[PDB]
Amino acid sequence: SGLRKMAQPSGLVEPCIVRVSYGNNVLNGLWLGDEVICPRHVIASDTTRVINYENEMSSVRLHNFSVSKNNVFLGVVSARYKGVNLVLKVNQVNPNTPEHKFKSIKAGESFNILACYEGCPGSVYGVNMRSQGTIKGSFIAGTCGSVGYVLENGILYFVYMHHLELGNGSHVGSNFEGEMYGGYEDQPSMQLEGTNVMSSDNVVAFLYAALINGERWFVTNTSMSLESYNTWAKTNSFTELSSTDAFSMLAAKTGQSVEKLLDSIVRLNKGFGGRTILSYGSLCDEFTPTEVIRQMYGVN
Amino acid sequence: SGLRKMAQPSGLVEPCIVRVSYGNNVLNGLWLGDEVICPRHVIASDTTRVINYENEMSSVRLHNFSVSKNNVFLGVVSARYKGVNLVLKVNQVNPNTPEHKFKSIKAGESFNILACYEGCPGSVYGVNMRSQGTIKGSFIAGTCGSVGYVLENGILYFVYMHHLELGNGSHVGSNFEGEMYGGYEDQPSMQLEGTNVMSSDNVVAFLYAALINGERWFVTNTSMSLESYNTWAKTNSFTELSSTDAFSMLAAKTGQSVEKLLDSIVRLNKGFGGRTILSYGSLCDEFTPTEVIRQMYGV
């Protein structure tokens, strides 16, 4: 069973998705307790040109918001910005609010996206946060407000809320404190993403998955120390490898030390030639050590 | 923008998942009404040797089954085989049984898998049915009994239950009528998969997505008519293309009419020459035209 991207189940999250419209703008929000959070650009008069958010808020009329789960309509009793998110106090507590926390995702970490269309959950898939604070997902007009979440040992953390797409196609969102990942502005502007730095952690994990799957052609039987690799990485847009401790059970299971995979990376970064790994034509950094271990052995 | 294999939400299915054990075997079952369905091989006293299902059925002792949700067990009142599925009547109705239907998936069609580990929902991902009736999923020991479903216009359909993995890594399961997709036997035998036939309409969809996503290297100053492509298709493990009717909007926004993409397929089959398309080193037939259209400019 090769390496494919998965999402954790979505059932705890689905009951919290609501439809939010204001003016001609429609998107999704997240309903926990007596509050609904959604991108603040929903109250903007024209999201196509620069927005003066202070003015849009001063002119705001609460009864112009339409917030709904299905046939359930939520009166908005107040609205305030919390960074790039709008927080709407509403007249009903969501009876299906799951127990949860909030946290921010770091470069190289994976999480789940529940893509929603006008208030209706549509799909779910796994993503991985890139160094510049963007993700390579799949969002179309109307998916703003979609929610990113991760479950860790029974704890549900909400971690992302979708805002916009960069000119280069990458996707940008915020955490629930309202800080935009990557620092990008919620405006129609020419901001650039910048150069992305590959996660060595995840690429080493990708190669272990390939070994476990029966592909070993990139195996060198020559090992590169963690220090030599790290100096090489600072100069080739890859992150410094923490320690080799995260791969202990993977190295034991395949018989390949991390240092041999490090040597494989330096060589494979030159180019796969006419060969592939897990059907990819180049190194993949989308899978974390923990994703691979669960997917390959399932002990989580 | 962007193309990813996605799955439809699992909230309706998760409450139906249960742990079913018997002997040294532990796998998953689907709990609907007062019945639990699971792969009948959970009854095998020895899974390393050919299984005689009549004998395992004759000597069954209902008390040896253990069926539970969370740490809560259910009583097994009876057990019968329905094709390769084991059906167990239990002493209790699932109060969370969603409204549902059952249907069979055809070659080239996509559906969702809710991968489960010994009674517990662990992950959700989309798959697509191969010509020989198998899927390329990610199932590891303990995920047998995982469930395949599809949502269409608000109607939930259960379509697959996972049984086993063939020597070549391909995955085999049955429908809810108890028929194994592809007619494979539910035995620990070394049966082969058979020649895999690539779905053409899905490959064109994929190439269209690559165009929309910005890759053009594979597009050339050429066109291969519907009729001639369908001819090459027949002797090169590829299906026939009914019409170009499905691609109107894709062909319209990319500016590449279908017959040009058909030409690309014929020429990529021999290798990408080291290049990639949406990151893959070979052609992908895992996405249907509808799946791609909905993700490209939105429905």
Please state the domain extents for chain B: 14-97, 98-185, 197-299
| Enclosing H/E stretch for A120 | strand A120-128
Contact state of B138 with A280 under an 8 Å Cβ cutoff: no
CB A71 within 8 A of CB A19: no
CA distance A177 to A105: 12
Instruction: Count the Cβ atoms, other than its own, within 10 Å of residue B66.
Output: 13
Q: Is B125 on the interface with A (CB under 8 A)?
A: yes
- Name every chain A residue with its beta carbon within 8 A of the beta carbon of B26: none
A239 secondary structure, DSSP code: P
CA distance linking residue B108 with residue B267, whole number of Å: 21
Q: Which residue has the tokens 């590891």?
A: B140
Cα Rg of chain B, angstroms: 22
CB A60 within 8 A of CB A106: no
Residue A165 near chain B (CB below 8 Å): yes
Contact A125 B9 (CB under 8 A): no
Is B41 among the residues known to form the active site?
Answer: yes
C-alpha distance from residue B264 to each of B208, B268, B271, B277 (Å): 11, 6, 11, 12
Q: Which one-letter DSSP state was computed for residue A237?
A: T
Best residue of B3, B5, B6 to probe chain A, by most A CBs closer than 10 Å: B6
Token pair recorded at residue B205: 């969809």
In this structure, is the dihedral angle defined by the CA atoms of residues B176, B182, B186 and B188, taken in order, positive or negative? negative
Q: Determine the distance in angstroms separating the CA of B286 from the nearest CA of chain A, rounded to an integer.
A: 12
Residues 245-274 of B with CB under 8 A from A: 271-274
Phi and psi at residue B59, to the nearest 5°: -95, 15
| Alpha carbons A78 and A89: distance in angstroms, whole number | 5
Q: Report the CATH architecture of B98-185.
A: Beta Barrel (2.40)
SS (H, E, C) chain B: CCCCCCECCCCCCHHHEEEEEECCEEEEEEEECCEEEEEHHHHCCCCCCCCCHHHHHHCCCHHHCEEEECCEEECEEEEEEECCEEEEEECCCCCCCCCCEECCCCCCCEEEEEEEECCEEEEEEEEECCCCCCECCCCCCCCCCCEEEEEECCEEEEEEEEEEECCCCCEEEECCCCCEHHHCCCCCCCCCCCCCCECHHHHHHHHHHHHHCCCCCCCCCCCCCHHHHHHHHCCCCECCCCCCHHHHHHHHHHCCCHHHHHHHHHHHCCCCCCCCECCECCCCCCCCHHHHHHHCCCC
DSSP state, residue A275: -
Structure token digits, residue A156: 């549900």
Residues 6 or more apart in contact with residue A54 via CB below 8 angstroms? none
Which element (helix H / strand E) includes A32?
A: strand A25-32
Flag if A169 and B9 touch (Cβ within 8 Å). no
Half-sphere exposure of A90 (CA within 13 A, CB side): 27
Phi and psi at residue B88, to the nearest 5°: -120, 125
Contact B137 A7 (CB under 8 A): no
Give the span between the Cα atoms of B291 and B293, in whole angstroms: 6
**Residue A225 one-letter amino acid:** S
Alpha helices per DSSP H over chain A:
53-58, 200-212, 226-234, 248-254, 258-268, 289-297
Longest dimension (CA), chain B: 70
* CA B4/CA A139 separation, integer angstroms: 10
Provide the 8-state DSSP code for A240. P
Cross-strand pairs, A238: A198
Q: Please, which residues have CB within 8 angstroms of residue A287's CB and are 6 or more apart in sequence?
A: A3, A5, A110, A128, A202, A205, A206, A209, A295
Inter-chain CB proximity A11 and B121 less than 8 Å: yes
> Which entry of A16, A38, A116, A144 is annotated as an active-site residue?
A144
3-state secondary structure of A260: helix
* Spatial CB neighbours of B270, under 8 Å, sequence gap ≥ 6: none
CATH topology (fold) of A197-299: main proteinase (3clpro) structure, domain 3 (1.10.1840)
Question: Which chain A residues touch B7 with a CB distance below 8 Å?
Answer: 7, 123-125
Determine the Cα–Cα distance for residues B134 and A171; give it in Å rounded to an integer. 34
d(CA B262, CA B95): 50
Resolution of the experimental structure, in angstroms: 2.0
Q: Is A144 a catalytic residue?
A: yes
Beta carbons of A174 and A161 less than 8 angstroms apart: yes
Check CB contact under 8 Å for B124 and A298.
Answer: no
- Residue B27 has which token pair? 């796998």
Q: Is B217 at the interface with chain A, CB within 8 A?
A: no
Q: CA-to-CA distance for A261 and A1, rounded, in angstroms?
A: 21
As a three-state string, the secondary structure of A148-209 is EEEEECCEEEEEEEEEEECCCCCEEEECCCCCEHHHCCCCCCCCCCCCCCECHHHHHHHHHH
Largest interatomic CA distance in chain A: 68
- To the question of domain B14-97 being in CATH 2.40.10.10, the answer is yes
Would you call A9 and B140 a contact, using CB atoms and an 8 Å cutoff? Answer: no
Query: Do the Cβ atoms of A171 and B8 come within 8 Å?
Result: no
β-strand pairing of B17-22 with A155-165: unpaired
Interface of A with B in 185-204 (CB under 8 A): none
Task: Check for a shared fold between B14-97 and B197-299.
Answer: no
Q: In this complex, which of B6, B14, B280 lies closest to A123 when CB atoms are compared?
A: B6
Retrieve residue B87's tokens: 């059906």
Nearest-CB residue to A2 (from B138, B143, B282): B138
- B6 has a chain A CB within 8 A of its CB: yes
Encoding tokens for residue B195? 């020649």
DSSP class of residue A48 equals: T
